[PDB]
Amino acid sequence: ARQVTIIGAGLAGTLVARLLARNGWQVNLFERRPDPRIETGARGRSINLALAERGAHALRLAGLEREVLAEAVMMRGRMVHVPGTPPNLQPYGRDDSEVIWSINRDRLNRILLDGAEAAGASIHFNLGLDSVDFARQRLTLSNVSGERLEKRFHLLIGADGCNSAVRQAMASVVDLGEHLETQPHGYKELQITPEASAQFNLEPNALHIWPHGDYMCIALPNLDRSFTVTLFLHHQSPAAQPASPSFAQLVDGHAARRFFQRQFPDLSPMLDSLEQDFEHHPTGKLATLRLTTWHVGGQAVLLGDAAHPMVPFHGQGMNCALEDAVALAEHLQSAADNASALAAFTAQRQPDALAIQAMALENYVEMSSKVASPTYLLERELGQIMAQRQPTRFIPRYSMVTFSRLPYAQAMARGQIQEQLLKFAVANHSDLTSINLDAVEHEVTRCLPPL
Numbered sequence: 001a002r003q004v005t006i007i008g009a010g011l012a013g014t015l016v017a018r019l020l021a022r023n024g025w026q027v028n029l030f031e032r033r034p035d036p037r038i039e040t041g042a043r044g045r046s047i048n049l050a051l052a053e054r055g056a057h058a059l060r061l062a063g064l065e066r067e068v069l070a071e072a073v074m075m076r077g078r079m080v081h082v083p084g085t086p087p088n089l090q091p092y093g094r095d096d097s098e099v100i101w102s103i104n105r106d107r108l109n110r111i112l113l114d115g116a117e118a119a120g121a122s123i124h125f126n127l128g129l130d131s132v133d134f135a136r137q138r139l140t141l142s143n144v145s146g147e148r149l150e151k152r153f154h155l156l157i158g159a160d161g162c163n164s165a166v167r168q169a170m171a172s173v174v175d176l177g178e179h180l181e182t183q184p185h186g187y188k189e190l191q192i193t194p195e196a197s198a199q200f201n202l203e204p205n206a207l208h209i210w211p212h213g214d215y216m217c218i219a220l221p222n223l224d225r226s227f228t229v230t231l232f233l234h235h236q237s238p239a240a241q242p243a244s245p246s247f248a249q250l251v252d253g254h255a256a257r258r259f260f261q262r263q264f265p266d267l268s269p270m271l272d273s274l275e276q277d278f279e280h281h282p283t284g285k286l287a288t289l290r291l292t293t294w295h296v297g298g299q300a301v302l303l304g305d306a307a308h309p310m311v312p313f314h315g316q317g318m319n320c321a322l323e324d325a326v327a328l329a330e331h332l333q334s335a336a337d338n339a340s341a342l343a344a345f346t347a348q349r350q351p352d353a354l355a356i357q358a359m360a361l362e363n364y365v366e367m368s369s370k371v372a373s374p375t376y377l378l379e380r381e382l383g384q385i386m387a388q389r390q391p392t393r394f395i396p397r398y399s400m401v402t403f404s405r406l407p408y409a410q411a412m413a414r415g416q417i418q419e420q421l422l423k424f425a426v427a428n429h430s431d432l433t434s435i436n437l438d439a440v441e442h443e444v445t446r447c448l449p450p451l
């Protein structure tokens with residue numbers, strides 16, 4: 001049996017461990033954190049994630065989708081909150097076929113861990129990768145208290161997240177051609193209790209957004225009617241606009257409270273533990289990192305956040321990571337040798353990773369705008385007309401990304417064609433009055449092949 005060592009029992013690492021192990025591979029998976037399935041007296045994390053068709057399908061192939069969805073809340077649409085103005089649900093699709101699932105990150109992780117072990121993978125916790133000797137095919141791990149352990153490896157999979165140690169190690173033997181693009185927003189996780197969300201009649205089967213331009217909040221529901229809220233806000237005010245809100249200004253929980261009372265007055269009443277959450281939950285960092293190479297010969301490869309850190313504004317990092325896991329296991333299973341598999345995997349996934357990284361950056365503007373411009377309303381309306389006329393040709397980009405398995409790069413290409421098509425048709429027309437719809441439709445049939 002072929003042997004593989006995987007670093008990182010997160011989302012991609014644990015899925016790929018299952019897929020390889022059930023195909024007969026001898027799999028050893030190493031994880032820095034303790035086993036989350038071993039219950040302790042400690043809290044438990046309420047981090048939420050949006051699971052979309054890509055990620056769901058990857059779990060489906062692994063035989064885990066039913067188990068995961070049993071513990072997921074359906075989000076049928078977006079609830080946009082603007083002060084006053086009673087929240088209006090914007091449905092994703094026309095029935096519950098087109099939905100996004102809200103799932104607890106650590107619940108998902110436990111299910112994946114069970115899945116990997118059921119398939120035959122051996123999982124080793126409390127062991128973080130420190131370094132790799134590629135020439136001698138050995139690596140060094142250590143626990144939190146630093147005592148070290150060495151292991152031989154044959155094939156190394158870096159599924160160890162956005163600060164990948166495998167990636168760091170590879171940079172010693174190949175030029176990764178890395179370029180880091182920092183992002184000015186930080187994030188803070190906050191909580192709405194089940195009592196609070198019921199009291200304010202917050203819809204459980206929706207994704208909620210409080211847009212506010214340069215900053216915003218989003219909330220995803222949990223099975224117990226609590227919500228996990230994320231604030232996205234600049235780390236610092238520009239020297240340009242020093243007065244503008246930023247984490248630097250929010251010097252403590254009381255400052256955070258005044259900020260929410262002023263800028264999010266309808267959300268603040270729902271955040272009972274705002275002060276405490278704010279001070280005890282560290283501010284997170286966001287970034288996009290792009291790599292020229294993802295592998296070292298047939299010896300090591302990167303997967304998921306290790307390969308392509310992205311900003312979280314499209315809710316697709318997990319989805320992309322699980323999709324990566326399927327692709328990597330597919331290539332490894334059937335290739336002539338590991339070097340061939342890793343090159344083919346990289347060639348396949350790299351253009352799709354670049355596309356979703358770009359689309360995720362673009363999606364911030366869509367989400368954070370408090371109201372839509374007059375002409376963008378007109379384009380969206382013409383687009384829905386075209387979608388009705390040619391539903392296999394005109395598919396809104398968000399829907400291609402979120403509710404289909406179309407490769408990200410094609411979703412982006414078709415999305416580009418569609419937006420341009422809408423702009424020329426919309427120009428100099430105040431409403432759908434002037435716009436000859438059937439002229440636009442064979443413009444659609446011209447440049448958008450049916451799918």
Ligand SMILES: Cc1cc2nc3c(=O)[nH]c(=O)nc-3n(C[C@H](O)[C@H](O)[C@H](O)COP(=O)(O)OP(=O)(O)OC[C@H]3O[C@@H](n4cnc5c(N)ncnc54)[C@H](O)[C@@H]3O)c2cc1C
Binds near residue numbers: 008010305
């Ligand atoms: C604010 C925010 C919101 C998000 N929302 C969504 C969403 O709604 N939908 C979505 O699709 N994605 C979302 N994402 C992205 C998502 O969290 C990640 O893309 C995804 O977890 C990446 O999966 P992964 O397996 O590659 O990495 P991870 O899930 O991060 O797992 C990496 C694993 O490696 C371990 N590890 C790290 N270093 C070492 C080491 N040296 N040795 C051993 N083990 C190590 C870690 O402990 C961890 O278990 C969000 C991200 C953020 C920051």
